[PDB]
Amino acid sequence: ADGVGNSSGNWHCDSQWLGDRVITTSTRTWALPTYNNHLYKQISSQSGATNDNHYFGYSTPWGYFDFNRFHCHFSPRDWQRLINNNWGFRPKRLNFKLFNIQVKEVTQNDGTTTIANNLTSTVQVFTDSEYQLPYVLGSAHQGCLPPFPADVFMVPQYGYLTLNNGSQAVGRSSFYCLEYFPSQMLRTGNNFQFSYTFEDVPFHSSYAHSQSLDRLMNPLIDQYLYYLNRTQTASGTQQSRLLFSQAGPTSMSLQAKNWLPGPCYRQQRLSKQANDNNNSNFPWTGATKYHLNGRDSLVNPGPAMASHKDDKEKFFPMHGTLIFGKEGTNANNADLENVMITDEEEIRTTNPVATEQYGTVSNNLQNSNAGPTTGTVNHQGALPGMVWQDRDVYLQGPIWAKIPHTDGHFHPSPLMGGFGLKHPPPQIMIKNTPVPANPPTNFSAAKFASFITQYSTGQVSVEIEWELQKENSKRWNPEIQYTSNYNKSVNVDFTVDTNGVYSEPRPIGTRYLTRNL
Amino acid sequence: AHSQSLDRLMNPLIDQYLYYLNRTQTASGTQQSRLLFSQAGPTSMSLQAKNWLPGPCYRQQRLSKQANDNNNSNFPWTGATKYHLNGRDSLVNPGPAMASHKDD
Amino acid sequence: LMGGFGLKHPPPQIMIKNTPVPANPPTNFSAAKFASFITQYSTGQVSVEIEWELQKENSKRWNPEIQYTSNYNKSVNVDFTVDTNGVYSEPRPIGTRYLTRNL
Secondary structure (H helix, E strand, C coil): CCCCCCCCCCCCCCEEECCCEEEEEEEEEEEECCCHHHCCEEEECCCCCCHHHCCEEEEEEEEEEECCEHHHHCCHHHHHHHHHHEEEEEEEEEEEEEEEEEEEEEEEECCEEEEEECCCCCEEEEEECCCCCCCCHHHCECCECCCCCCCEEECCEEEEEECCECCECCCCCCCCCHHHCCCEEECECECEEEEEECCCCCCCCCEEECCCHHHCCCCCCCCCCEEEEEEECCCCCCCEEEEEEECCCCCCCCCCCCCEECCEECCCEEECCCCCCCCCCCCCCCCCEEEECCEEEECCCCCCCECCCCCCCCEEECCCCCEEECCCCCCCCEECCCEEECCCHHHHHCCCECCCCCEEEECCCCCCCCCCCEEEECEECCCCCEECCCCCCECCCECEEECCCCCCCCCCCCCCCCEEECCCCCEEEEEECCCECCCCCCCCCCCCCCECCEEEEEEEEEEEEEEEEECCCCCCCCCCCCCCCCCCCCCCCCCECCCCCECCCCCCECCCEEECC | CCCCCHHHCCCCCCCECCEEEEEEECCCCCCCEEEEEEECCCCCCCCCCCCCCCCCCCCCCCCCCCCCCCCCCCCCCCCCCEEEECCEEEECCCCCCCCCCCCC | CCCCCCCCCCCCCCCCCCCCCECCCCCCCCCCCCCCECCCCCCCCCCCCCCCCCCCCCCCCCCCCCCCCCCCCCCCCCCCCECCCCCECCCCCCCCCCCCCCC
């Protein structure tokens, strides 16, 4: 509704704080290539892949837009305003736009490449509102919008997996032609828009607890409930006798309590200091993992559990945390100093430590002849009276995941983090419409393999409205805040360098402010 | 029935931005303890981070439908998975919903 | 201290840049940022209109006052004008203080 010479949109990047809510908007420039020559191709694992790694699926010519990382929507300063001042947040609604679209045709002769406007060429866009396609967003892939608004990103290619037996397929395997969906077709001067409203979801926990689960008592007062203090006589000839006391300040571990820690599935502990770890290769063998249909899948990061106990910070659970990486880090076999390993430390007060046993139970019936023996609980499922915390969310990381559609689920919170949505934000699909090269002058029923090489660029705006939960605390003393360091440095954190490269020094989490259990 | 396995929900084309621990030992040379991190992707799907776990299990004993591939002994009761109430062992039948067999 | 008016809210900054236009992407997805751009520049027209308020001279002095004047003597180039090569020059730093007023 514009034409060649009128812009179809404007650049809105700002954030807006109304104090009950914050509305963050991001506009970015994208570049969409032609994927796999306008073809749907089936893909599968090769021979020699282990049983665990086999897959079967389809790659599509279509691309897709992914805003599902937080730093897309928040600047490091806007993230600080949120995490320092608030006990929780959730998304409300979003608004998406594609505008200022440009389709460029590319010709190559000799070594000289030539790029030109193709004014009549079209790009196709559809959002999947009814969740009919396989939903790949919640898998924490790349291709999401950049953190930094001046970066130009490449739109990732869409592809999906279905059932496989080995590297083959079964009869239930679904094939989806995305051409089989209604999609808006846009020339330069056409724009795309849609709106989305998040379903009701719990606020995230932007707080840490000011009390441990087992410390909820009154330190001054004794209980009126007795516990068994002694199974044997105190002094004299040792003899079996049952003696009962009332627990109190001096023994807190012995008191009766109303609640249990959350469930655990135990992790292997790793030291960050070199040579304090066993010499052997055991990321896979010593791993905690689940088993489906013959395949062992690593449990990563897994159920939310504290990363380490008190003054253990040098240790982290193996596969039990999110691990980011520094700008410029190699994608294969990077050193510990290159990656940024996150920390669950705040949830010590409720969730078990990932590397420690849940507890201990008795495995026998004792008697005068048989002494009591007790077994160790490495894994525990939900018991009545458990209370736990979800894994934290970071500036870098999943905002949401799609809850799988199944008969049942238990506490459907995504294990990488974020919000579980039955109806998440839909997938936005985009491809370049094929433009044939010159046909032969005699009819041929063969399909065209000959296409004009072209790509498209444009602008993409995303606007999310977030609801805030303000901090009500009465504590007298000050609270921990997320702060920059005042000491001088060559580079400012969360900033470009001399070469124009934007980097993030650390994985900022959302839990600073405190709250009582 | 589902058209996707729970651990296959990913995009087969694209790598993750999350690192995992690829190596607890040095790749080549003198073997030495070192922690090496990669990004999971198409080639290793089993190693990627995932949002969900499979349902709960209470394990069963496996039987073959072909004659003589089963142990020779009588164990419908003894080798059974069963619960316990008030002194009585009750057989767990059919029990929590679980797949009957894996592939092939 | 260089001169002019001090404004708490001066005329705002007008910022402009050319939107990046990427060159052809690779045909396989890469998460690296684009370093490859179509070289381009922009030209256009810019108008500025300021309205100025004047304070007229009320003086009662009898004798004439110093004015800023051109020199009538002949010269190769006219002041505040282009030369033969088309170059515009300003011969002198004209100031604003000529008319007189009592303390």
